[PDB]
Each structure stands twice: as C-alpha cells, then as structure tokens.
Design a protein around this ligand. Sequence first.
Ligand code: CLA
Ligand code: HEC
Ligand code: BCR
Ligand code: BCR
Lengths: 56, 97, 56, 244, 137, 56
Amino acid sequence: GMFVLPFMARLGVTGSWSGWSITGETGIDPGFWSFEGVALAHIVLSGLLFLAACWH
Amino acid sequence: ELVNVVDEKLGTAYGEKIDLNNTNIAAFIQYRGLYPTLAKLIVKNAPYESVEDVLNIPGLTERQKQILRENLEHFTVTEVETALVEGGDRYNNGLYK
Amino acid sequence: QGVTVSFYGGELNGQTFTDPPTVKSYARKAIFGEIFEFDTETLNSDGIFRTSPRGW
Amino acid sequence: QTLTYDDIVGTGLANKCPTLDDTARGAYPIDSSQTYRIARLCLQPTTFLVKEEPKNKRQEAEFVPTKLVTRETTSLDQIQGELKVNSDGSLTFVEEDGIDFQPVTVQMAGGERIPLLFTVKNLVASTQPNVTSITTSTDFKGEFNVPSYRTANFLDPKGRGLASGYDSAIALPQAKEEELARANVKRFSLTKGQISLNVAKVDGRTGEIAGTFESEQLSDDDMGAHEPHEVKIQGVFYASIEPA
Amino acid sequence: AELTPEVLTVPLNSEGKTITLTEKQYLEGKRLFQYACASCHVGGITKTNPSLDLRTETLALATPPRDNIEGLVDYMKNPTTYDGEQEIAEVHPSLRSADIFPKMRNLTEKDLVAIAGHILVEPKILGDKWGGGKVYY
Amino acid sequence: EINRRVQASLASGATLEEAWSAIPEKLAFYDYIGNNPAKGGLFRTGPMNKGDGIAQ
Ligand code: CLA
Ligand code: HEC
Ligand SMILES: CC1=C(/C=C/C(C)=C/C=C/C(C)=C/C=C/C=C(C)/C=C/C=C(C)/C=C/C2=C(C)CCCC2(C)C)C(C)(C)CCC1
Ligand SMILES: CC1=C(/C=C/C(C)=C/C=C/C(C)=C/C=C/C=C(C)/C=C/C=C(C)/C=C/C2=C(C)CCCC2(C)C)C(C)(C)CCC1
C-alpha cells in the first residue's frame, strides 16, 4: 500500500537511515537523502512556507 | 511441556537436603563444621555420583572426614542443574538478608 | 509440601490433581474465591476485572 | 615505553588485544615432555555477523553485518589454562579461568537489537597432530559452552524469572495461561559454540602468538521467549605460552 | 513487659552455668556494641558477610560454640571462622588486633562481657528481628 | 452460607462429593471476587463479562 515510497525510489532515494534499502542490498549508507531525510526536508520546507505565508 | 526446572528441583531431595551438586555454599552454615573450609572443598570438587564420594576429596584431614561422616545424613546428590550452577551462583546467588 | 488439590461438586467433581504446575494454577484461582470456567473468546475478554452496575 | 593505566584510561586501548611486530614470523618449539601453559589469551572481536531468517524455508541464509551499540566492552582477556601436549604432538588448550564472556548487543538493518553472550567458556581447542613447533600455520579448533545470556535470578519487566519472581502474569489475573506459557515459564539455555584460532605471528623467543579467530554461536533467546540467531564473530587474538 | 532478671539470664559457659546480667551492664553492652560493632552488626546481621549473623542458633553451631558468654568473649579475644579453622584477627576486630582496630584498644574484660551479654539478650527481646534483616524491620 | 449448608449436609451423612454438589452454582458464583464491585478500574470499560469472560 505504499504510495509515495515508489516516487522517492524512482528518482534515486534508495535507503533508510535505519540501514535497509529498497533493493534488499545489505550495507549501503544513503547519506542525508534517505527516505527519512526526504520526509524531514518536506516538513521543514512546509514550516518555512507557512511562515512566509504569514508574512505575505 | 514447559517447566520451571528450579521449581521442579524443589520436588527432589534438593528441596529437603544439601545437594552437593547444586546447593549454594551458604547452606553449609546449617550444620556444625562445614563452613567455610569443608564447604569450599565440597563445592570445588563437585559433581559427585553419590554422597559417599565426598570422602574422596583429596587432602582432607582425618577430623575433616569425621565431620563429613557425621553429616552424610544431611547431604544428597542430584543432577547438575545448570540454572543453579552457572554464573557462580553456588558461591553467591544474590541472596543476602 | 506435596500439595495436591481435589474438587468436590461442579465440573471437576471427584477429580484430584497432583502435578505441581496444575495445583499451583488452581491455587492462584482460589485466591479469587470459587473457581469457574469462563468463555473468554466470545467478547475477546482481556482477563482484567471490571466493576458492576452497582459500582458504576 | 610500556604504558600505564593513566596513559590507557579513556583511550579505548584497554579493549584491544596486544599485537606483535611484523618481524615475529618465528616458531615456538614445543618440547613434547614439558608442561606448557597459556598465561594470557585475549580475543578482540572486530566483526559481528548475524544470520538472517528467510520466511520461506529456502533462500540464501546469509550472514549480514551489524553495528555494535554497547561500545568498547567486547574483548575477552586474561584467559588462562593448561596447554596439554597430546600423544600425537597435537596441543589441546583447556580453558580454565579469566574474563571469558562479554554481553554484546548488535543492531541489524531496521533496528533489531541482537544481544549475545560473546564467550569462550570451557573452551577445549586443539591443533593438528604432529606439531613440534607452534608456527604461523597452526590452527586451534575447538568448542565452547554458551550459557544463557541472563542467569536464573533475572526478572523480566513483569517480575517473572527462573530462580526468582512470579510464574504468572499478575496484571491479567483471569487470562488464559496456555498462550502466555512461553513468556511465563523461563528456561535456561546451554548451547555449544565453535571457534577456530588461526596463528599468524609467533614471537618464537618470547612465546607470544597472535592471529585471527572465527567463532560461531547462538545469540540470546531471552530465557526461551524467542528463537536465537546464529552469530559469527571474527576478530584477532593474542596468546602467551609459558612453561609451567 | 519489663527487663527482668529472667530475660537477663544468659548461659555463662557451655557446661550449663548461667549468669544474670544487671540492667546497667545490659545498657553498657548496647552502648559498647553500638560503638564498636554496630557498623557491621546493626540488628544482629553482618553487613560485610550476610551469611553469618548473631542469632543465638547460629552462634550455637559455630566452632567452638559462641552461644554463651565465655564463648563470645573468647571470640572477641581470638576470632575465628565459623568452623574454627582460621584465626581471622587480621580482618575482624579483636583485642589482639587492637593495633589495627583502635576501637578495640581500651575494652576491658567487663566490657567484653557486657557486649557478649547484649548479643545474647537482644534476641530474647527482639525475637526474629535480631539477625533477620530488613524483612523484619 | 456455603460452608453452613455443606456442614449441615455433612452432619446428615453426605459424602464430600454429595455435600458440595448440592451447593447451587448461583450461590458459589456470588462467592467469587470477580463479582465484587470494588475490583474494577475507571477506564476498564464495559461489562464484567469483558474482563474474566462469560462464566460457563
Ligand atoms: C449515571 C450514568 C451512567 C452509569 C452509571 C452507566 C453505567 C454503565 N454503562 Mg451507560 N450510558 C450512560 C450513562 C451511564 N451508564 C449515558 C448517559 C449514555 C449515552 C452516552 C450511556 C451509553 C452506554 C453505552 C453505549 C454503553 C454503556 C455501558 C455501561 C456499563 C459500562 C460502564 C463503562 O464502561 O463506563 C466507562 C466510564 C468511563 C470511561 C468514565 C469516563 C470519564 C469521564 C468522561 C472523564 C471526563 C473528565 C472531564 C472532561 C473533566 C473536566 C475538567 C474541567 C472541569 C476542568 C455501565 C453499567 C456499556 C455496556 O456495557 O452496556 C451493555 C455500553 O456499551 N452506556
Ligand atoms: C565489620 C567491619 C565488622 C566489625 C566492626 C565487627 N565484625 Fe563481627 N564479623 C564481621 C564478619 C565479616 C564476620 C564473619 C567472619 C567470618 O568469616 O567468619 C563477623 C563475625 C562475627 C561473629 C561470629 C558470628 C557467628 O555466627 O559465629 C561474632 C560473634 C562477631 N563477629 C562479633 C563481633 C563483635 C562483638 C564485634 C564488636 C566488637 C564485631 N563483631 C565487630 C564483621 C565485623
Ligand atoms: C479519519 C479518517 C481518515 C483520516 C483523515 C485525515 C488524516 C485527514 C487529514 C486532513 C488534513 C490534515 C487536512 C488539512 C487541512 C488544512 C487546511 C484546510 C488548512 C487551511 C489553512 C488556512 C486557511 C490558512 C490560513 C492562513 C494562515 C494560517 C496564515 C497565513 C494566511 C492564511 C490566511 C492563508 C482516513 C481517510 C485515513 C480514513 C478514514 C477516516
Ligand atoms: C538551496 C538548496 C536547496 C533548496 C532549498 C530551498 C527550497 C529553500 C527554501 C527556502 C524557503 C522556503 C525560505 C523561507 C523563508 C521564510 C521566512 C524567512 C519567513 C519569515 C517570516 C516572518 C518574518 C514573518 C513574521 C510574522 C509572523 C510569523 C506572524 C505574523 C506577523 C509576522 C508577519 C511579523 C536544496 C535543499 C534542494 C539542496 C541544497 C541547496
């Protein structure tokens, strides 16, 4: 039932910070741009747009 | 089925006597002459196939054998329960006061 | 202490139990007074006591 | 030049096995009539690998790498015992005493912590036959005991344990016990583990050998509440041979 | 209840003779016990070795029996292990190791009898509280 | 009341099985702590059957 997870993987986000990847390969490190790093980048962006909306 | 092996061992002679294969060393205080000298030697030279094998610990004096022979009635031997002997629990089983 | 349990009346009338796990499980139920068979499956009963309308 | 506690403390060097210079490609003559002794055996794990559980029966049951989470607490050190020359000039090492276990927790991809009692308890390891000199080709191979990761006084969070504690779930005074039985009845496991020590460097003069090891043993089964994982432990060793 | 003669009558030796302590030497014994012994034997246990206590039934099974005044006084002069095999004066307070246990220095024979009396009387008063530990607090 | 009826039955020559088999299930069921209204919890919701089960 994964809806957004294939969209992240399609453009190259393969891994989790918890250490698995979507291909099943054991022992890659994704750096910042894991699935959690993408999600965090969207939440942060959501809050910054919220503040900008207030200002405008 | 699934059984608590320590609870099951209380149904044996371990529940009623000093098991030379299993009982923690502090139970040797219960009778005169065992602790700590003979108790240390009994725990160290375990396991025993019978109680009377306790008179074959080497280096015992003559009075030491006489102490043990007085106390053979208070001793028993069972199978080595690993739950009671691992971790050094025969010397310190976390029971104090 | 060689504890056994025998039942008089009820479902287990005339039965006697000697193996210490079984005797213990009945002793733990005996702290509640009389011992009853319970259908826990119909309501998905959780095993934790509830109060009566008198209490509510 | 030889360090003290004040140089060592807080640096992590205390968790390391001692090493040997590259020059020490020597050989330690075993006199077949003398009694020898291991004065100090140290095992420093470097890698912990855990076997995965494919729900399939089949598949590749491969050993996967794990991250250590319990810090530099992993080495076994100060292990002693007799090194008995046998009939055929094989040496057998009988472990007597030392710091021969360490609880270790590793973490798998996904966050599963795997606790294990990394141990060489009651190690009986033997060489090949016809070994007059301990060389850089000697391989000790042996079996040890893996006792339960918790001992019998350990209480679970609901106060259940083996030699102590409740035998039931007291929070659910009228639940059906028969499905709680695996959690209610604690069981002390005792398993066998298998180690192979490969000599790589012998100081033939001093009698200090060093090399690598590989150990295979089960992880913790949590007093029988779940199935343990197969763990492979790889690292380095140092031993010091001494005539008793 | 009062602190009668009959409470204060304790076995003097092992043969069978008793001595009846006065209330003054009971209270000097409790004071001297507190000053010299209670840091390890508060309430009749033993903090640094809980396997051995000061219950009269444990003192009776010691070698030689310590469940009388003369046996207790001798222990304070020459303490042994529970089987009487090792002298332990280098690690237990006594008059022969009063150089290393300086609270033992000025204890007289009447002081040791008073301490020995307190150890024997106190279980007749406290019951299982004496030597029972925190379960009986 | 249960013990009274039993002892009256045992004073008339009943066996132990006969004495206890005469005690009504209704009377024994009142002698059971899971029917005590002081055994519940504020957020333990629902009928008493939801705890221990439906008594059979
Ligand atoms: C006097 C009122 C009263 C009493 C004693 C009962 C009693 C009962 N009801 Mg009934 N019921 C009532 C009124 C009552 N009801 C009303 C008014 C309705 C319509 C909503 C119902 C609808 C109803 C249903 C649908 C069911 C029951 C059931 C039951 C039984 C189970 C009780 C339970 O689980 O409660 C649980 C009680 C609590 C969880 C307590 C709630 C705590 C409150 C809400 C906290 C609020 C705090 C407040 C906001 C603080 C303000 C702070 C501010 C001032 C600063 C029990 C016999 C059940 C049953 O078994 O039927 C067969 C069941 O299924 N009742
Ligand atoms: C701790 C620092 C102690 C102080 C102070 C005193 N004692 Fe003690 N006592 C201590 C230990 C560790 C032991 C056990 C020694 C052993 O290995 O056997 C004891 C033992 C005794 C006993 C014997 C108890 C028995 O059951 O036989 C007695 C009677 C005794 N100690 C008395 C005693 C007195 C009177 C003390 C004050 C002067 C005193 N002890 C000090 C530890 C310590
Ligand atoms: C229950 C349920 C569910 C869930 C759901 C969900 C989860 C949803 C959510 C939803 C959401 C979550 C929504 C949101 C919304 C929002 C909005 C709508 C907003 C708005 C805003 C605004 C309006 C703003 C304003 C402002 C400000 C603030 C400032 C600046 C300016 C302005 C004015 C602009 C599901 C389906 C699963 C299932 C079934 C049931
Ligand atoms: C570069 C880069 C990138 C990108 C990024 C981005 C995308 C950014 C964005 C940014 C943003 C998006 C920003 C924002 C900002 C905001 C702000 C700065 C705001 C502020 C506000 C304010 C100041 C306001 C105030 C107020 C309020 C709050 C309330 C009311 C009143 C007022 C109005 C006063 C990436 C990562 C990809 C990569 C790398 C590089």
